[PDB]
Design a protein around this ligand. Structure first.
Ligand SMILES: *[C@@H]1O[C@H](CO)[C@@H](O)[C@H](O)[C@H]1NC(C)=O
Ligand SMILES: O=c1[nH]nc([N+](=O)[O-])c(Cl)c1Cl
Length: 351
């Protein structure tokens, strides 16, 4: 189990002003630290945030969080379940800011909600330094879904924070799972008139304004004012990053298909095949990646994350090979992208 710590700086809050926090399981003697960002979509105006507060309140508030959580998948401390980093110091950071981990805005007389995702990450890192992180050799910032996008948006800022605080020996790296999206044409189209009909580019453009969202500096300087939404798309922000980042992405991610309005005749067959080909293309120059040809919403904190393989290599193995590469390697690959063109053409896909 990982134990809850609410942030000592209570000005760093979830959406409703309750303190943010993190769950921690220390591993004495290990100098590896895994900080995992939870996912769970986002909200981008008062009305859709209000709805989320009614039925997804744990994603907007710490008031009902449990005292402990069980670490699973890459957060498991059992080598049987986590061949990669079972002995690491484990940190699960709940997603309670609804801002893809990008926000820097407090609740105030002008703001019904606080959007502090970027500040939550910084505050967790700061408070962990007093709990052993100061001795770390590697800090892996990992995350799934909106948390995977959050890794891309925040890994270089964590690296900069530690450098400025006087810890240049901690190697900051990113692991972005299921957060690599395409700003593509939908299979069926709707103008952004309400929440359902609004495509992610427009929802994110509105969200950045509502959240006071921040993006990595080099990407911000490329796209400039009004266009920072571009930095939420992996293939555009990744080339701007300095920290090593390993990208895990299903070629047919269920969230991508959902925003594309895909719920099989020739038109849809071609659409799906083109989506997989486009995703594969965006990963061509990503040297550390794992992209199986599966239709899935499954994530790296699931207990059976060890089962899927690309070209005969599992993700825990690929991550271990990545660790070795950061000290090509005979029999220890790090670039694993399926080439077959249809979901479940890989037999190891999740059932
Ligand atoms: C608390 O957090 C806020 C927002 O990030 C920051 O401005 C302030 O300096 C922090 N205070 C302390 C004592 O760390
Ligand atoms: O959490 C998410 N899930 N899906 C998407 N998508 O566009 O497919 C996005 Cl942008 C986010 Cl932030």
């Amino acid at each position: 189990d990982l134990r809850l710590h609410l942030l000592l700086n209570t000005s760093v809050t979830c959406n409703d002003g309750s303190p943010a926090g993190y769950y921690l399981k220390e591993s004495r003697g290990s100098r590896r630290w895994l900080l995992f960002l939870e996912g769970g979509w986002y909200c981008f105006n008062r009305e859709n945030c209000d709805s989320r507060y009614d039925t997804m309140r744990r994603l907007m508030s710490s008031r009902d969080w449990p005292r402990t959580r069980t670490g699973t998948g890459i957060l498991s401390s059992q080598p049987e379940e986590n061949p990669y980093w079972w002995n690491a110091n484990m940190v699960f950071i709940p997603y309670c800011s609804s801002d893809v981990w990008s926000g820097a805005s407090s609740k105030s007389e002008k703001n019904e909600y606080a959007f502090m995702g970027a500040l939550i990450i910084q505050e967790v890192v700061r408070e962990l330094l007093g709990r052993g992180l100061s001795g770390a050799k590697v800090l892996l910032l990992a995350g799934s879904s909106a948390g995977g996008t959050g890794v891309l948006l925040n890994v270089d800022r964590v690296a900069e924070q530690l450098e400025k605080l006087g810890y240049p020996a901690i190697q900051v790296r990113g692991l972005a799972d299921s957060g690599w999206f395409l700003d593509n044409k939908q299979y069926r189209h709707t103008d952004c008139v309400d929440t359902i009909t609004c495509a992610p580019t427009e929802a994110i453009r509105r969200g950045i304004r509502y959240w006071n969202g921040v993006v990595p500096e080099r990407c911000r300087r490329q796209f400039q004012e009004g266009e920072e939404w571009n930095c939420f798309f992996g293939y555009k922000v990744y080339p701007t990053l300095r920290s090593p980042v390993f990208v895990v992405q299903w070629l047919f991610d269920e969230a991508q298909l959902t925003v594309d309005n895909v719920h099989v005749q020739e038109g849809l067959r071609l659409y799906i095949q083109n989506l997989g080909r486009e995703l594969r293309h965006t990963l061509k120059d990503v040297p550390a990646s794992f992209a199986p040809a599966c239709l899935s919403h499954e994530i790296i904190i699931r207990s059976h994350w060890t089962d899927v393989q690309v070209k005969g290599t599992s993700l825990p193995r690929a991550l271990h090979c990545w660790d070795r590469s950061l000290h090509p390697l005979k029999g220890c690959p790090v670039h694993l992208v399926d080439s077959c063109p249809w979901p479940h053409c890989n037999p190891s896909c999740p059932t």
